[PDB]
Short mmCIF file of C-alpha atoms in Angstrom, two decimals:
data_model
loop_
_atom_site.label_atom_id
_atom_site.label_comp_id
_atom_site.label_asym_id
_atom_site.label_seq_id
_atom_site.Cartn_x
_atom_site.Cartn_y
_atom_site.Cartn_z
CA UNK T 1 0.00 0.00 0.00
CA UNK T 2 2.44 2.42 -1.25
CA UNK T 3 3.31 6.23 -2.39
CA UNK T 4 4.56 5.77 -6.17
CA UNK T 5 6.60 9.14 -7.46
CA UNK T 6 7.27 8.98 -11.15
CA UNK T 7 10.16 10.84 -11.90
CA UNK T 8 11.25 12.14 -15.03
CA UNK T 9 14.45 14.19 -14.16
CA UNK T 10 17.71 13.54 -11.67
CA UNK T 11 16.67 16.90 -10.21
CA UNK T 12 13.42 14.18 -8.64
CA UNK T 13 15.77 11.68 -6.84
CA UNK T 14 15.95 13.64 -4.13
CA UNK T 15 12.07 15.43 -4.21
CA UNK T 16 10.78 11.75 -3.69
CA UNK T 17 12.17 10.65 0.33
CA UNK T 18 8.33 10.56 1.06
CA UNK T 19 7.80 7.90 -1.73
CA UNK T 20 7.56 4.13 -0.99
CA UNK T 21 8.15 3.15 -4.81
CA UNK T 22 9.94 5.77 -7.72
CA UNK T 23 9.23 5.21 -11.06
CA UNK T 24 11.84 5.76 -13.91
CA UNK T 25 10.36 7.31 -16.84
CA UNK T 26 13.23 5.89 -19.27
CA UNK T 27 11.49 7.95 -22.10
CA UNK T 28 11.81 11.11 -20.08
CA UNK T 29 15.21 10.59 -18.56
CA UNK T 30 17.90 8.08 -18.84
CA UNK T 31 17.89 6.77 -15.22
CA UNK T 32 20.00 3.69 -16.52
CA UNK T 33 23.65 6.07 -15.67
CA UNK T 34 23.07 6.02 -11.51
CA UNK T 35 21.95 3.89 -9.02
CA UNK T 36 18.56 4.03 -7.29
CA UNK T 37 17.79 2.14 -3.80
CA UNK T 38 14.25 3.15 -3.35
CA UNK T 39 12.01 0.47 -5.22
CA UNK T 40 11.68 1.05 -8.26
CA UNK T 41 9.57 0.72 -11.73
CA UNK T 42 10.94 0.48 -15.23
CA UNK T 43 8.60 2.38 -17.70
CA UNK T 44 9.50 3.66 -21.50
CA UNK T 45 6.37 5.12 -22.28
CA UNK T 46 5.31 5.23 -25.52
CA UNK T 47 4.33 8.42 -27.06
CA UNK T 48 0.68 6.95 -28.36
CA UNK T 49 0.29 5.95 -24.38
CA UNK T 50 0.79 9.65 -23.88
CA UNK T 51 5.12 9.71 -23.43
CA UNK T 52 7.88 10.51 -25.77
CA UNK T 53 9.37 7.23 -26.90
CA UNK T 54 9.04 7.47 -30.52
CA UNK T 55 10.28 4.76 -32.30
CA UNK T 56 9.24 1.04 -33.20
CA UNK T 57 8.63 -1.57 -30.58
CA UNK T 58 12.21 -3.04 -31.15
CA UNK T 59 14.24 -0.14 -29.96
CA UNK T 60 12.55 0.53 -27.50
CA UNK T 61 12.06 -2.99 -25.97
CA UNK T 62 16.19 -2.79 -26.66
CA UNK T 63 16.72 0.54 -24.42
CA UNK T 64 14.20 -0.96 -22.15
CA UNK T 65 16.53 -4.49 -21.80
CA UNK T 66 19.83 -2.31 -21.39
CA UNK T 67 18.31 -0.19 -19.01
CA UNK T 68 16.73 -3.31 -16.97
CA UNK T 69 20.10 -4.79 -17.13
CA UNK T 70 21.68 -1.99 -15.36
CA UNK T 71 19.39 -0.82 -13.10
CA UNK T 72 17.45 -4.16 -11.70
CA UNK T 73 14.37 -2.84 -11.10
CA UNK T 74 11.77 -4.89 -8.70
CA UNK T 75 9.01 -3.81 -11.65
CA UNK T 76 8.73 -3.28 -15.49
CA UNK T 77 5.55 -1.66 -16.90
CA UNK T 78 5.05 -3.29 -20.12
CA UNK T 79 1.67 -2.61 -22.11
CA UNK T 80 -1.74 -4.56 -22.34
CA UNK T 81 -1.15 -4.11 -26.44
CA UNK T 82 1.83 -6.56 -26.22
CA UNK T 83 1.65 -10.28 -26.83
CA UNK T 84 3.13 -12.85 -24.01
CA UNK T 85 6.33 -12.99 -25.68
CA UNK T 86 7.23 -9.60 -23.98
CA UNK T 87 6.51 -10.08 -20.93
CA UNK T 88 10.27 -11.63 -20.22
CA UNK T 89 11.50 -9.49 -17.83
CA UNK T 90 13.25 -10.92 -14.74
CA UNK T 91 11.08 -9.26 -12.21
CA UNK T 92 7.59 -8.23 -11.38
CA UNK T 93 5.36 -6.70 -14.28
CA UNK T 94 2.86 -4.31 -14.55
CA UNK T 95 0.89 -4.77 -17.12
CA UNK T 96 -0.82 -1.41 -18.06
CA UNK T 97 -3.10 -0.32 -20.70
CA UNK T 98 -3.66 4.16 -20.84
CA UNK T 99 -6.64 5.97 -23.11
CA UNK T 100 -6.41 9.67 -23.23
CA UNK T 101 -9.72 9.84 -24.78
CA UNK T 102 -11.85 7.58 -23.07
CA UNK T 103 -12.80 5.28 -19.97
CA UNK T 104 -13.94 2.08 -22.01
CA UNK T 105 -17.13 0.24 -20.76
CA UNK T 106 -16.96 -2.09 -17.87
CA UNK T 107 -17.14 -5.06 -20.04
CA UNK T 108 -14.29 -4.00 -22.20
CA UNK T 109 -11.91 -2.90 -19.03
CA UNK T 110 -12.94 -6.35 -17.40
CA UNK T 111 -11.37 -8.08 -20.55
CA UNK T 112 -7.58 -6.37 -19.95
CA UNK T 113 -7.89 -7.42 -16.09
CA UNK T 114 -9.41 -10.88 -17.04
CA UNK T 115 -6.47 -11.48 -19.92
CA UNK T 116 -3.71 -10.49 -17.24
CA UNK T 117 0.07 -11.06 -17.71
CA UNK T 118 1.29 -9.04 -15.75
CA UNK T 119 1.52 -9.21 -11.55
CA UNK T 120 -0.53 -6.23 -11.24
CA UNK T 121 -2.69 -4.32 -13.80
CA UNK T 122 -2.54 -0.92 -14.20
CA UNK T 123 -5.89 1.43 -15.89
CA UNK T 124 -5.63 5.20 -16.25
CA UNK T 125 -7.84 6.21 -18.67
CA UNK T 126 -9.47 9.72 -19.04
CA UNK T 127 -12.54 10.93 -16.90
CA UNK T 128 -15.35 12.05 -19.12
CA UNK T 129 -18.73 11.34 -16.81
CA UNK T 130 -19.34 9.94 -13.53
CA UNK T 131 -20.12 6.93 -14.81
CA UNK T 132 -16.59 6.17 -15.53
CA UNK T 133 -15.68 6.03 -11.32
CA UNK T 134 -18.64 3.44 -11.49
CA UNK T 135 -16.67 1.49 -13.76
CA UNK T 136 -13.23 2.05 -12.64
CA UNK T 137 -15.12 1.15 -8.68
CA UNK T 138 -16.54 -1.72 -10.77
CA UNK T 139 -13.53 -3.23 -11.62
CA UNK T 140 -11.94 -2.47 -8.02
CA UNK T 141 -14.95 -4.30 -6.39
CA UNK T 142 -14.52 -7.45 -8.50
CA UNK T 143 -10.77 -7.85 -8.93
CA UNK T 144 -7.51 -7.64 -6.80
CA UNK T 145 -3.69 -6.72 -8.23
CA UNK T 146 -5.38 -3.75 -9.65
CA UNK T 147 -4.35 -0.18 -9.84
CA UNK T 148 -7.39 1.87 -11.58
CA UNK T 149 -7.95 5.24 -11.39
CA UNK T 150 -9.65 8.56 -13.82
CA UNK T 151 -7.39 11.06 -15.48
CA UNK T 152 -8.48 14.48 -15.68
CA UNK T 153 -9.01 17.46 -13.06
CA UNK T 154 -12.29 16.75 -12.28
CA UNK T 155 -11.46 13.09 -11.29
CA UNK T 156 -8.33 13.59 -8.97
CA UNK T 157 -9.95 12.40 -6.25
CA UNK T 158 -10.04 8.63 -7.69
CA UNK T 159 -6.47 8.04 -7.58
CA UNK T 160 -6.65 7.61 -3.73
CA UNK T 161 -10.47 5.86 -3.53
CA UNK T 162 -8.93 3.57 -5.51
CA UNK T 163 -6.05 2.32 -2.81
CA UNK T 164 -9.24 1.85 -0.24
CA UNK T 165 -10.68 -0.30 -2.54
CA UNK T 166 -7.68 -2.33 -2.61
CA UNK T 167 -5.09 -0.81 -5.10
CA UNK T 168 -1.51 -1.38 -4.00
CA UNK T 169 -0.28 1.85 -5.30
CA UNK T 170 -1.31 5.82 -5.39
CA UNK T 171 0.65 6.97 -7.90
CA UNK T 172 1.85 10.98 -7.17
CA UNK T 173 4.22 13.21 -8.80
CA UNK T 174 7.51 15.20 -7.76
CA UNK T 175 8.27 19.21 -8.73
CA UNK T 176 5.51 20.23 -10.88
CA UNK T 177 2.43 18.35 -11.78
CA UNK T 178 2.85 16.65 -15.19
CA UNK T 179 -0.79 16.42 -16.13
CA UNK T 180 -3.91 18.23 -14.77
CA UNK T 181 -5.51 16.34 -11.83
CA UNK T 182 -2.67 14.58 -10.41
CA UNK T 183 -1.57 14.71 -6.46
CA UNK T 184 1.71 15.17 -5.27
CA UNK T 185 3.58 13.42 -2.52
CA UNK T 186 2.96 15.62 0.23
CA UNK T 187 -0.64 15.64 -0.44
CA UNK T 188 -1.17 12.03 -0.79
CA UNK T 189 0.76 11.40 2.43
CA UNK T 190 -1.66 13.94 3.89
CA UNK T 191 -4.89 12.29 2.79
CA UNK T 192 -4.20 8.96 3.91
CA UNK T 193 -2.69 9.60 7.22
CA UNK T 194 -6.18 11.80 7.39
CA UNK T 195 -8.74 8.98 6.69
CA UNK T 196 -6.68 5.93 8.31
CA UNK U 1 -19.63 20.48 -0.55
CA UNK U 2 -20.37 21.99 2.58
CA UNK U 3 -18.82 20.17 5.89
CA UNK U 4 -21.73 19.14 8.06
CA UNK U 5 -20.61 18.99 11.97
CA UNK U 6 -22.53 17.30 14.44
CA UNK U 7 -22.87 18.86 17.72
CA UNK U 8 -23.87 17.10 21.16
CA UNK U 9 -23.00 19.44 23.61
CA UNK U 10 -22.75 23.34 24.20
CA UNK U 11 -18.96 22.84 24.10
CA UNK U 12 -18.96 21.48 20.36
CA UNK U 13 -20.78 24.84 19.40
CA UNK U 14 -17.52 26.41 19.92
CA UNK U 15 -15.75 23.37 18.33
CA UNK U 16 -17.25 23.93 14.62
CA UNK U 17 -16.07 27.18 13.36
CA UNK U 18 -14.40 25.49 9.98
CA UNK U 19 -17.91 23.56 9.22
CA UNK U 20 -20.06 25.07 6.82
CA UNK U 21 -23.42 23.63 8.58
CA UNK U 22 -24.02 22.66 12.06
CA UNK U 23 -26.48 19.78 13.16
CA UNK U 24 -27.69 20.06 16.46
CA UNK U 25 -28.96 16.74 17.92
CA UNK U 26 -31.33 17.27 19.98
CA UNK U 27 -32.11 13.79 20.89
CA UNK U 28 -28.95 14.20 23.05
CA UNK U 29 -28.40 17.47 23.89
CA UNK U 30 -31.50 20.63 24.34
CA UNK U 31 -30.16 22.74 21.79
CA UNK U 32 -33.51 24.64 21.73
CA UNK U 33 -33.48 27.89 22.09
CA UNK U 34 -29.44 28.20 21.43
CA UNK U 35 -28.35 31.07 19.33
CA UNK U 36 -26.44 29.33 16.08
CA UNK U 37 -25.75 31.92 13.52
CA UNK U 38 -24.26 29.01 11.64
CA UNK U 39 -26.38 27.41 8.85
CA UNK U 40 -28.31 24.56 11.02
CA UNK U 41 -29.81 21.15 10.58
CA UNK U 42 -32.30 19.95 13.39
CA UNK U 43 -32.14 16.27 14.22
CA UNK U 44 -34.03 14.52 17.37
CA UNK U 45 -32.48 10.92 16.28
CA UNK U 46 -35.01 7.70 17.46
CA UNK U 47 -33.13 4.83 19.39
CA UNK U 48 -33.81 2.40 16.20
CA UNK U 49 -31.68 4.63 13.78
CA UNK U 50 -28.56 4.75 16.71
CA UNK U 51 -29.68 8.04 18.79
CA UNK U 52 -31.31 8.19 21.93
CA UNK U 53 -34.77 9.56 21.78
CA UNK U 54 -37.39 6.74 23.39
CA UNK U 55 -41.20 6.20 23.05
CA UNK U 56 -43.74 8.30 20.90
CA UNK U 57 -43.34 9.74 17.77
CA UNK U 58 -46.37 11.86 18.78
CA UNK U 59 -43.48 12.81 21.79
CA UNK U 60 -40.50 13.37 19.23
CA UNK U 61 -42.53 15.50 16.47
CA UNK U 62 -44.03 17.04 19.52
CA UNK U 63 -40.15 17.74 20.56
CA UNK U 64 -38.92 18.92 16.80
CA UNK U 65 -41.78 21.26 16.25
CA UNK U 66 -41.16 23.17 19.72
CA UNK U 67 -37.02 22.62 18.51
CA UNK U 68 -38.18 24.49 15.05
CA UNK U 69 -39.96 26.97 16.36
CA UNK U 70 -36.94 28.65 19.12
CA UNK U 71 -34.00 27.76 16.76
CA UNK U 72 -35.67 28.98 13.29
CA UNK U 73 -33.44 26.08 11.47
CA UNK U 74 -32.48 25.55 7.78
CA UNK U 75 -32.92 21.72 7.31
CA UNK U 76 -34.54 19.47 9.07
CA UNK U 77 -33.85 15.84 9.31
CA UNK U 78 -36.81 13.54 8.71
CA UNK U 79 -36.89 9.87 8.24
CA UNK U 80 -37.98 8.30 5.47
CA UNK U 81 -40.15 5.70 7.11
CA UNK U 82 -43.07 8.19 8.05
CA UNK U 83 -45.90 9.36 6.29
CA UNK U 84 -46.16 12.02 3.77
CA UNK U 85 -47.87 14.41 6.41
CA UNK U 86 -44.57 14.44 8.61
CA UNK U 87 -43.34 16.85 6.29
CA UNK U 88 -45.06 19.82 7.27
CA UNK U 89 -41.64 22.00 8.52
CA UNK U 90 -41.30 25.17 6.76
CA UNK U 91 -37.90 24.45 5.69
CA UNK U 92 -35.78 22.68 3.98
CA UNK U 93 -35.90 18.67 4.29
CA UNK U 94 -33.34 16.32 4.70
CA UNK U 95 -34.82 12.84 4.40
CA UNK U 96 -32.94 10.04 5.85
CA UNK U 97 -32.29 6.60 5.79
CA UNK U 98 -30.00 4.25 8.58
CA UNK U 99 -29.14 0.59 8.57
CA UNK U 100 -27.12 -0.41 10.90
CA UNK U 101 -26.83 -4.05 9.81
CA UNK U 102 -26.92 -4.07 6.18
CA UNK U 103 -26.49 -2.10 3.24
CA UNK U 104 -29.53 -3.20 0.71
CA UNK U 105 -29.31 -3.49 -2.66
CA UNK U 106 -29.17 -0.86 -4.89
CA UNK U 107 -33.06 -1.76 -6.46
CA UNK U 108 -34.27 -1.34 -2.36
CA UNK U 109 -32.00 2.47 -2.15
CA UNK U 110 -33.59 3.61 -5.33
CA UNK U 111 -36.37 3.17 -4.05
CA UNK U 112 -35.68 5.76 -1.73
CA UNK U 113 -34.71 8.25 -3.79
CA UNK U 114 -37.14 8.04 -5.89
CA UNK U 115 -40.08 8.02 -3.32
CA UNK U 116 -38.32 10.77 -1.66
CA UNK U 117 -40.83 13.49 -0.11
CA UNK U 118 -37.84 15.59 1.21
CA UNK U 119 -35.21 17.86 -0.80
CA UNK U 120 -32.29 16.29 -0.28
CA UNK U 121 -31.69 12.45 0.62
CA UNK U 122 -29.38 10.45 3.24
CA UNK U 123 -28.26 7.23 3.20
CA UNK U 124 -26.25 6.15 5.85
CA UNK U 125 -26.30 2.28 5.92
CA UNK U 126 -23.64 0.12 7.40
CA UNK U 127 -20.49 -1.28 5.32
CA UNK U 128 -19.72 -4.79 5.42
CA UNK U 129 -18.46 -5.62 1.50
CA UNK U 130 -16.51 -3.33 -1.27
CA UNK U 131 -19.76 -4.47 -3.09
CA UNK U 132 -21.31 -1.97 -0.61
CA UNK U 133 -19.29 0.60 -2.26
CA UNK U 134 -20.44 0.39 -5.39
CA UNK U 135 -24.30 0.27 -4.57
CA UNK U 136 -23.96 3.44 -2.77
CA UNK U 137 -21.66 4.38 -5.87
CA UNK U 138 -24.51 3.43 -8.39
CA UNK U 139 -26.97 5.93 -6.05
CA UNK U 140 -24.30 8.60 -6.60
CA UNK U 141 -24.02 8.56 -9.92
CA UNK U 142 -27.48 7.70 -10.96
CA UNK U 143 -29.09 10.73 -8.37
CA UNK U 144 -28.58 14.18 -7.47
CA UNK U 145 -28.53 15.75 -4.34
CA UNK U 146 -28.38 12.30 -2.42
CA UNK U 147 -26.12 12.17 0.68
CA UNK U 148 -24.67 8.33 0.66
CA UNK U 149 -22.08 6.82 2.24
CA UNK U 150 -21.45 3.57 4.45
CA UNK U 151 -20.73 3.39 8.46
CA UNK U 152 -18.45 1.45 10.09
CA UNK U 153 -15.03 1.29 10.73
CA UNK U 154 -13.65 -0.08 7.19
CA UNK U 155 -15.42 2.28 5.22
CA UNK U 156 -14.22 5.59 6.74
CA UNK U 157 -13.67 7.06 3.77
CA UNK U 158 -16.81 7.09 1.81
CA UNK U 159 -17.97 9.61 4.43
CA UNK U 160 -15.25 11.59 2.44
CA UNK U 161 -14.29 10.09 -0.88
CA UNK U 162 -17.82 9.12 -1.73
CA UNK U 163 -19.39 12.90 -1.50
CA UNK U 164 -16.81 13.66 -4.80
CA UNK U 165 -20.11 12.52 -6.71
CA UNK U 166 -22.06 15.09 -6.28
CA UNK U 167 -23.04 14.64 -2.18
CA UNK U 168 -23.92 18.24 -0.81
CA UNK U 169 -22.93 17.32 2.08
CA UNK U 170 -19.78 15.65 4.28
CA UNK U 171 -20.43 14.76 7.63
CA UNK U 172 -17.89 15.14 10.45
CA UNK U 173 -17.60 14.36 14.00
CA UNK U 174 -16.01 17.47 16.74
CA UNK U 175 -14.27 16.34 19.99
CA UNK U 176 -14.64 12.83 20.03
CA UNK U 177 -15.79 10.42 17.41
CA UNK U 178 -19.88 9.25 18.42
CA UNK U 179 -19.06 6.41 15.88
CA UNK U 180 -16.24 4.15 15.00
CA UNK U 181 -15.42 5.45 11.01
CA UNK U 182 -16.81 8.86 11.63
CA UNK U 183 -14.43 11.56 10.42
CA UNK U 184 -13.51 14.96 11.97
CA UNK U 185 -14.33 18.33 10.95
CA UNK U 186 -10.59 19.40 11.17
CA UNK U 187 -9.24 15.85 9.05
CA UNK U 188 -12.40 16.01 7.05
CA UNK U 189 -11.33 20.22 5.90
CA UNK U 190 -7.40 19.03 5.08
CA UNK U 191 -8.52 16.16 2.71
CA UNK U 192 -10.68 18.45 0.78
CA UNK U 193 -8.52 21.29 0.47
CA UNK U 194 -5.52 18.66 -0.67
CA UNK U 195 -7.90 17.20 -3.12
CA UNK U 196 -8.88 20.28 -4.51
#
């Protein structure tokens, strides 16, 4: 049940003490040249899952192996779009799957969680309607090793119901916030110390 | 949303200066005649729905209307299990629901809604699944103005989390927590400010 800073600088090592688990944004940054003790995720996100990796799926599974090499991470985020042969990484996986433009139906979010590789799913998918948290809850009432939550300003406040309904992470950000809606470290701390 | 406190004492009068509203229980403390500049719900809370007025309801209207007439209040808190003709307070009306042992399903808590004789609805029904979560989710973001979150221990922060979907209202405890879950006013204030 754990703080998760994503960090996209060397500036962010130090802004995250507060954090449980940092996650290297190997698209952002290369983390690969120092050594991190915190735990730790691997991610090389994808420009089309709203990053700046842009290139095909073989360099970038390439910078991802040299930089998994080098850094032993205790997770890699690889994608829901994958097939099985991908998910060979020597650690823990999280296998995520990002819309910018939409929450899907129940039904078609219970698919990704149902067709798991990964050790934990990941869901972050834009907040257009209420009835998105009813899915997103949904999904949180009916499955485990799930981390769902709403992009967007108005739907902030999802990212931590979602650890009381049994997500293992809140992820937060360090410095500024990278995209409207999310909470930074402080604040998260703040809120669940608050409700217990 | 507006933080609700809930007073049962003179001494929590001076307790509730960051709550929006006030609800003086009058079940357990003779708030009438009390000057409250505050906005102001009046509750006299029957044994069977956890408060301690006994016997009558010819004795506890009896007890409200005198209550209404001194304090000149805003809402007042009726319960949805009496009779259309209850509702004669010229005021606003908060009807209310309590279930200590169970949270229905969602078919029985629409029910409530949509028979509802008062202006705004509460449903305060105690927590004992996640799948309790989403019912009272469902209510949220099928209604408006509906007040809905679960009791207990475990479910703490619905009383919060759960009022993101539209809830007027968040209740909070002063001094000491009259419930295990309840939230306080000061906890309940940080949470929403860090949320935004």
């Amino acid at each position: 049940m754990k703080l998760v800073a994503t960090l996209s600088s060397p500036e962010e090592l130090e802004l995250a003490e507060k954090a449980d688990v940092v996650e290297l944004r190997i698209d952002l940054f290369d983390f690969s040249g120092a050594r991190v003790d915190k735990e730790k995720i691997l991610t090389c996100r994808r420009v089309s899952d709203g990053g700046k990796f842009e290139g095909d799926e073989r360099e970038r599974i390439e910078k991802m192996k040299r930089a998994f090499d080098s850094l032993n991470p205790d997770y890699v985020d690889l994608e829901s779009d994958l097939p099985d042969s991908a998910f060979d990484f020597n650690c823990r996986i999280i296998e995520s799957y990002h819309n910018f433009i939409r929450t899907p139906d129940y039904s078609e979010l219970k698919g990704i969680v149902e067709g798991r590789r990964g050790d934990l799913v990941k869901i972050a998918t834009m907040g257009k309607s209420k009835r998105d948290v009813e899915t997103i809850v949904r999904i949180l009432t009916n499955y485990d090793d799930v981390v769902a939550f709403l992009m967007g300003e108005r739907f902030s406040f999802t990212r931590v119901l979602a650890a009381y309904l049994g997500s293992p992470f809140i992820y937060c950000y360090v410095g500024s916030p990278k995209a409207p809606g999310q909470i930074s470290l402080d604040d998260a701390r703040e809120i669940i110390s608050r409700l217990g």
